[PDB]
């Protein structure tokens, strides 16, 4: 059974109460963000740019390690983090790194934070698959938010527009969201196969 | 009711079919074939 008839209405007979091109662009942006995260962070091995996005609590806010520290390579299998600008947030940086799922165990040396490269092992690959699943779930949440915004716009326009028109646009947006989440699942499966 | 121009050859009336059958082209036929005639 076919069970799902794809609809592409025009986007052009509407053009005004919803922008299907804009919605598709937002969903493509979500997909691109997921792919960029997969490429930058979880390649096979942690790099100074991979842990530059770990948020650290500072002044009741969220800031990145790259923003509040200087991350570089000292040894081929070592990462050196200099929190000279913000020595207060050293413990918060350790917390961010340690409960980060990237399997980085840092050593506190006052301010010269020392992160060894653990290894590439079966356990490391399993944790990387777990991180890939977590990031796919976060991207799915972002896609759900994007779809909810379009539904809210339709609700705003739902006082003078025909009920059939609103239903058709809702079906189209749901179809786009389903296609994008299927693409997200495919990318996650490909990345999992690559890691394992 | 079909349009005047269609894609399915738009089958004709029986009278028109008979008219075309009657008016089919009849090529001339010589009394004796000339291939291996002198």
């Amino acid at each position: 059974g076919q069970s799902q008839t794809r609809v592409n209405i025009n986007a052009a007979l509407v053009e005004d109460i919803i922008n299907l091109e804009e919605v598709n662009e937002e969903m493509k942006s979500v997909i691109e963000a997921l792919k960029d995260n997969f490429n930058k962070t979880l390649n096979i091995r942690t790099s100074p740019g991979s842990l530059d996005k770990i948020a650290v609590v500072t002044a009741d806010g969220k800031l990145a390690l790259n923003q509040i520290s200087q991350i570089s390579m000292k040894s081929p299998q070592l990462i050196l983090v200099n929190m000279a600008s913000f020595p207060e947030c050293t413990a918060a940086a350790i917390k961010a790194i340690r409960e980060s799922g990237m399997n980085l165990n840092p050593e506190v040396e006052g301010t010269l934070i020392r992160v060894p490269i653990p290894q590439v092992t079966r356990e490391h690959r399993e944790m990387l698959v777990k991180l890939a699943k977590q990031n796919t779930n976060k991207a799915k949440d972002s896609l759900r938010k994007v779809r909810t915004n379009s539904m809210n716009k339709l609700k705003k326009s739902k006082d003078t527009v025909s009920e059939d028109t609103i239903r058709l646009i809702e079906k189209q947006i749901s179809q786009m969201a389903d296609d994008t989440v299927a693409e997200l699942d495919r990318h996650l499966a490909v990345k999992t196969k690559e890691l394992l | 009711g079909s349009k005047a121009v269609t894609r399915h050859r738009r089958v004709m009336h029986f009278e028109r079919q008979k008219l075309m059958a009657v008016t089919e082209y009849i090529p001339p036929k010589p009394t004796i074939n000339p291939r291996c005639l002198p």
């Binding site: - | 079909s2 399915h8 089958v11 029986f14 079919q17 008979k18 008219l19 059958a21 009657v22």
Partner: protein, 94 residues
């Protein structure tokens, strides 16, 4: 097994009934008769100017006869015999 969709003779897909040699011969005979008719209808005995008013008194007389026949419409005469013949229903033997 070989169904004909819809009705046999009205739909987009009809029954492919062909044309027979008898039908062709009948049409050819009708065409020959019509060709003879249109040959006989080619050369008139009189021309348009010669026929102008050649039989007009007869048409006027026919119309006048029709008018007179229509104008003669009127109720019929009532006679004493018609009224007095109803008493004959009680004629007996003395």
């Amino acid at each position: 097994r070989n169904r004909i969709p819809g009705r046999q003779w009205i739909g987009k897909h009809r029954r492919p009934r062909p044309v027979s040699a008898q039908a062709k011969q009948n049409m050819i005979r009708r065409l020959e008769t019509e060709a003879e008719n249109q040959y006989w209808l080619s050369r008139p005995f009189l021309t348009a100017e010669q026929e102008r008013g050649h039989a007009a008194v007869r048409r006027a007389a026919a119309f006048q006869a029709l008018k007179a026949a229509q104008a003669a419409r009127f109720p019929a005469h009532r006679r004493l015999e018609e009224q007095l013949g109803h008493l004959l229903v009680t004629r007996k033997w003395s």
